[PDB]
Amino acid sequence: PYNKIVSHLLVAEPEKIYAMPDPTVPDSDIKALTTLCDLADRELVVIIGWAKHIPGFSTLSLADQMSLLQSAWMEILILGVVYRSLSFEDELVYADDYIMDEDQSKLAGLLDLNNAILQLVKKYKSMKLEKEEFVTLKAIALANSDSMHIEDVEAVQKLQDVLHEALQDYEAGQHMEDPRRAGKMLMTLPLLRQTSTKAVQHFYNIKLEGKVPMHKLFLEMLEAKV
Amino acid sequence: PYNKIVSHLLVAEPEKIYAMPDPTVPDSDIKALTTLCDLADRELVVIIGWAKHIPGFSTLSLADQMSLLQSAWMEILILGVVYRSLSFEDELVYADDYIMDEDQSKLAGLLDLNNAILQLVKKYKSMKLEKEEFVTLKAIALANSDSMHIEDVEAVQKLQDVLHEALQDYEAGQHMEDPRRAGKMLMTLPLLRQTSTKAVQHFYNIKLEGKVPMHKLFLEMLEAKV
Amino acid sequence: NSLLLHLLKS
Amino acid sequence: NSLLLHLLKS
Ligand SMILES: c1ccc2[nH]ccc2c1
Numbered sequence A, B: 001p002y003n004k005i006v007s008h009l010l011v012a013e014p015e016k017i018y019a020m021p022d023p024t025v026p027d028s029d030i031k032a033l034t035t036l037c038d039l040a041d042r043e044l045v046v047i048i049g050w051a052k053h054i055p056g057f058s059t060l061s062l063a064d065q066m067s068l069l070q071s072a073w074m075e076i077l078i079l080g081v082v083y084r085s086l087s088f089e090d091e092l093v094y095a096d097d098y099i100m101d102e103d104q105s106k107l108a109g110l111l112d113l114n115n116a117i118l119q120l121v122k123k124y125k126s127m128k129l130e131k132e133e134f135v136t137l138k139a140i141a142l143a144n145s146d147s148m149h150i151e152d153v154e155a156v157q158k159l160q161d162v163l164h165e166a167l168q169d170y171e172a173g174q175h176m177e178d179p180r181r182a183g184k185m186l187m188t189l190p191l192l193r194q195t196s197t198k199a200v201q202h203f204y205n206i207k208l209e210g211k212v213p214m215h216k217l218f219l220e221m222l223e224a225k226v
Numbered sequence C, D: 001n002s003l004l005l006h007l008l009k010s
């Protein structure tokens, strides 16, 4: 066997979501951006439901649950795209029906952002990131998201500690060849933070330019004060 | 005793630098920003000299040494301000003669940035960050800075590994009460990355507005492609 | 009022 | 040419 938290997060994993780009709409930056924002709005619903499965999360105040999700949502979305892309080459699997190559990224105005996502992919391919490690890092990214609005600083530190312990226990059992592998996984979080913050800034600016329709939950998460 | 790399980084620590704001110049945002950029230009010189003391750094290509410093310089500057501020309350010790309170931050247009630096301070105060830990995290931040321009990806990973090992060895000896303390220290790097990237963006915009004089090395590091 | 809060209360 | 490169070559 292995670590129960890691096993629990694997069973909490949401189902795959299709992008369903509109086949009637001519290809354009607006179409690509609309498709991605619609897909993110849908994935946000299942992320909220997923977070409730994380031990201790639902015991925080609703304010602290909101703060963690408002800080971490884009890291959680990006880590999904990264994980889905590990068996691919220079391509991002937003969804099984929405795989973006460099041309599509350029056409959507996402070349710089998607190149940074591919830098995350490159590092996790070299580390041979496992699904167990991915789900544990998603939960650590939520807990460690550095909201400036936390009420119960100690409870959020205890949630970080619980999930860090789960990663370290997992690695101690599954990866005896590399006693520092848990710390190597923790050392990938700064690039995820950097890429997330760029993506939020990029989509905030698309929101201000007003040419790409966005649904209610996505707009709520974009407008959050961070 | 303890870890030799940690001991070596302590002896490599640069001397304190005074800000020396111009006592003839009326207080203003321009004065504050000029003083900070002049102080950063001077500290950049000693950071370059310091990095050469880190085992393996000088053995990288000059291109890779430049890439690591171009990605990490602002994290190294901020971690210094953070460390200097740990015994203070709601104040940032840029230098012994340049301690910024909330009013001064507002007057300089730095309230949001300095509040994020104070969030780094708050977390390291709770963790009781030691000088040994600070110098080791400065070196890890340099090695783990995620430049997109690295030539020798493997050599930079080995430098990360060497410095991570030094942190983990240090913690295993000095902090037996908390076997996960090294990972807690690694988990502080995302907020440093986030705060650094905001600071570079903020000072880049001051550079474009053209009202604050900046010296050659500081401008070189601000203009670097990241 | 917040959709995020509504979905956290389910 | 680069001041950073000059200082790394000292
Ligand atoms: C960035 C933007 C839109 C997205 N939709 C799904 C993941 C994701 C990341």
Ligand SMILES: c1ccc2[nH]ccc2c1
Pocket (backbone or CB within 6 Å): B036, B037, B039, B040, B043, B077, B078, B081, B094, B199
């Ligand atoms: C941000 C801006 C200017 C600075 N000078 C010294 C540290 C530092 C950080």
